[PDB]
Scaffold this active site. Structure first.
Site, PDB file in Angstrom:
ATOM      1  N   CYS A   1      -4.849  -4.692   1.540  1.00  0.00           N
ATOM      2  CA  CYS A   1      -4.864  -3.235   1.383  1.00  0.00           C
ATOM      3  C   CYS A   1      -4.877  -2.972   0.119  1.00  0.00           C
ATOM      4  O   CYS A   1      -3.649  -2.740  -0.318  1.00  0.00           O
ATOM      5  CB  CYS A   1      -4.088  -2.379   2.398  1.00  0.00           C
ATOM      6  SG  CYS A   1      -3.879  -0.488   2.087  1.00  0.00           S
TER       7      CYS A   1
ATOM      8  N   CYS B   1      -2.570   0.353  -0.648  1.00  0.00           N
ATOM      9  CA  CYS B   1      -1.017   0.149  -0.355  1.00  0.00           C
ATOM     10  C   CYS B   1      -0.372  -0.531  -1.438  1.00  0.00           C
ATOM     11  O   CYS B   1       0.803  -0.045  -1.935  1.00  0.00           O
ATOM     12  CB  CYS B   1      -1.151  -0.719   0.952  1.00  0.00           C
ATOM     13  SG  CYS B   1      -1.948  -0.022   2.241  1.00  0.00           S
TER      14      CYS B   1
END
Lengths: 105, 105
Positions: free
Chosen positions: B32, B35
């Site tokens: 991700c 993230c």
């Protein structure tokens, strides 16, 4: 089929081809779990809604476009028509995707 | 710091330890980009706002917790207080995160 936008000028190319049709752009990333989960449903949607244009943009390859659109998570679905932004959906929420296609097609 | 929730039992425990403080939970994944991009800023936020509890949940390890919260992309920030859901933020939008912390603190 979900056609993959190669660059900004291929992007603009496709919004013109789309003419008056609603355009749905999937901003995705290669190893992204939610992106892979919804991908087959999006392929299916693109084959059943032939009067909507479905595009996809690899945010790793097209950071230009992704940052231009302030993409904050993937997948993000951008909804456009005649060059204007109609709406956006952050995330792989299939039923919300369906509702927004219905609302805007 | 941002404490990592290990399981449902640990999630409930951390919510209880928070008393009546605002709790901000970062639902994240390993694969991700967004993230990773916001992770340092969340860490520094947890230091500046020491009267808010910051937690993180790895959606690949805690699948049932993620499903319970209809996580559709990462990072998603859940805002909780006194066992109540207050807000959700889909994506790594740091200024929006700051606004929602201030709103719900």
């Amino acid at each position: 089929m979900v056609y993959q936008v190669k660059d900004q000028e291929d992007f603009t190319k496709q919004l013109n081809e789309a003419g008056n049709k609603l355009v749905v752009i999937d901003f995705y990333a290669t190893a992204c779990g939610p992106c892979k989960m919804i991908a087959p449903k999006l392929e299916e949607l693109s084959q059943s809604m032939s009067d909507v244009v479905f595009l996809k943009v690899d945010v790793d390859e097209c950071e230009d476009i992704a940052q231009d659109n302030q993409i904050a998570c993937m997948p993000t679905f951008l909804f456009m028509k005649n060059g204007q932004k109609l709406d956006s959906l952050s995330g792989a929420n299939y039923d919300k995707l369906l509702e927004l296609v219905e609302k805007n097609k």
